[PDB]
Amino acid sequence: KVETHEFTAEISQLMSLIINTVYSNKEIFLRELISNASDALDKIRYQALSDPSQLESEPELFIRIIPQKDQKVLEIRDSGIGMTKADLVNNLGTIAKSGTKSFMEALSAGADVSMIGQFGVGFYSLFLVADHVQVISKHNDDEQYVWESNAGGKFTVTLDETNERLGRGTMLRLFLKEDQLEYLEEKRIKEVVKKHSEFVAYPIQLVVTKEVE
Ligand SMILES: Oc1ccc(Sc2ccc(O)cc2)cc1
Secondary structure (H helix, E strand, C coil): CEEEEEEHHHHHHHHHHHHHCCCCCCCHHHHHHHHHHHHHHHHHHHHHHHHHHHHHHCCCCEEEEEEEEECCCCEECCCCCCCCHHHHHHHHHCHHHHHHHHHHHHHHHHCCHHHHHCCCCHHEEEEEEEEEEEEECCCCCCEEEEEEEECCCEEEECCCCCCCCCCCEEEEEEEEEECCCHHCCCHHHHHHHHCCCCCCCCCEEECCCCCCC
């Protein structure tokens, strides 16, 4: 059951700008998504300080990076607070109208794209390396949903009947551009994490698939 929605115009504008930019330091996308994951984990930790049972849906707090070489997909999963269906529509398709406009104005003045996080819209940096994204999310007391975008003007939200259960949290599935496949490689991912994400309160786990010989 696929619900189609339209992006706020200025979010559409910024996705188009990012997906087309030729910026040469695209690895900063991973810092931004890890920072979003850490923020989500902060929120469930805050709730769990009052009510520890909120952790029981997924007791381990983590950020996990899962390259899917066969699919040309990079997944970034967290066990943070997650997003409801209404959140997905609101958080990703509408709110952040302010940050997107201020950031585009800053770009026109000469700002570096790596400053995107300071306007609160670092999520959209994923379009530096991906042309399509699914956001799978599960909030306590709500169902698991999938939000899907191709940087155009429409997104969809669907009850998730096809992905692994998250327990609680969010998984971004980045469909990488054909010239950005370096970010499926263990060595490259490690380099970028160590360079830009040294001060993160949660374990950053990398899933590596190796042949037994
Ligand atoms: O204040 C909040 C509330 C929910 C989240 S969920 C999430 C969203 C995007 C993302 O790239 C990773 C996780 C994050 C911060």
